[PDB]
Design a protein around this ligand. Structure first.
Ligand code: ZN
Ligand code: ZN
Ligand code: ZN
Lengths: 120, 120
DNA sequence: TAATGGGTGCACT
DNA sequence: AAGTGCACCCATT
């Protein structure tokens, strides 16, 4: 159980996924929304994996809490196959639109390394 | 396996549910969409597991929709009175008024009237 | 958005 | 009767 800290001051819950993607895409993890509402978003691996990420707003702390549950995946983590999905390409395009040069560089290198079949 | 006839000339998957509601609501059957795509819609009983299934499929060859009822057996009682208290029925009823479906409105008015009087 | 658990309709894929 | 991503819900404390 991992309590992420610190967490950005999200203005919209829809800022959460892209932020988690930057973190987990490099790990070869491809997160999707299992459930969401105004005050929570729960993530799992894209399709029987027990890996979970629970984001929920805390009134007491006036912030979003993000907790990582159960790191043990029931599958292989392969970043190479991830770069082919549509969610990844949109994530990548989003990075550019937000002019996140640092992240953009990180993923260009990751993609290049992957194209060389180097361990990830 | 029961084929329904006659079937109106639907021009969109989304026109099918409202038609099916007019037919099955009076039978104490509350249909929901299990799944849909541009050429197929699968319906079942709202979850309140029941095997009952309705499948509407578009024949490209015949350029018409065919509707079939499967597993006509239910795992639950069929109560119209309970149905009338749901949000989807109320929305269904308002849709009839929107469409100026005078005859349908009359029909369901009587069904509700009899329902309120505990009349079977 | 009390905190925290889960249900399920349904269109996308 | 495609499987599942996602969000509109509800339940219990
Ligand atoms: Zn939003
Ligand atoms: Zn996983
Ligand atoms: Zn049923």
């Amino acid at each position: 159980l991992i309590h992420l800290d610190p967490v950005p001051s999200f203005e919209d819950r829809h800022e959460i996924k892209p932020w988690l993607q930057k973190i987990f895409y490099p790990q070869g993890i491809d997160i999707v929304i299992e459930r969401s509402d105004s005050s929570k978003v729960t993530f799992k691996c894209r399709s029987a994996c027990p890996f979970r990420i629970r984001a929920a707003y805390s009134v007491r702390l006036q912030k979003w809490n993000v907790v990582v549950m159960n790191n043990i995946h029931s599958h292989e983590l392969r970043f190479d196959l991830i770069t082919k999905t549509d969610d990844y390409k949109k994530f990548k395009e989003n990075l550019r639109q937000k002019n996140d040069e640092k992240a953009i560089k990180t993923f260009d290198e990751l993609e290049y390394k992957a194209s060389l079949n180097l361990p990830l």
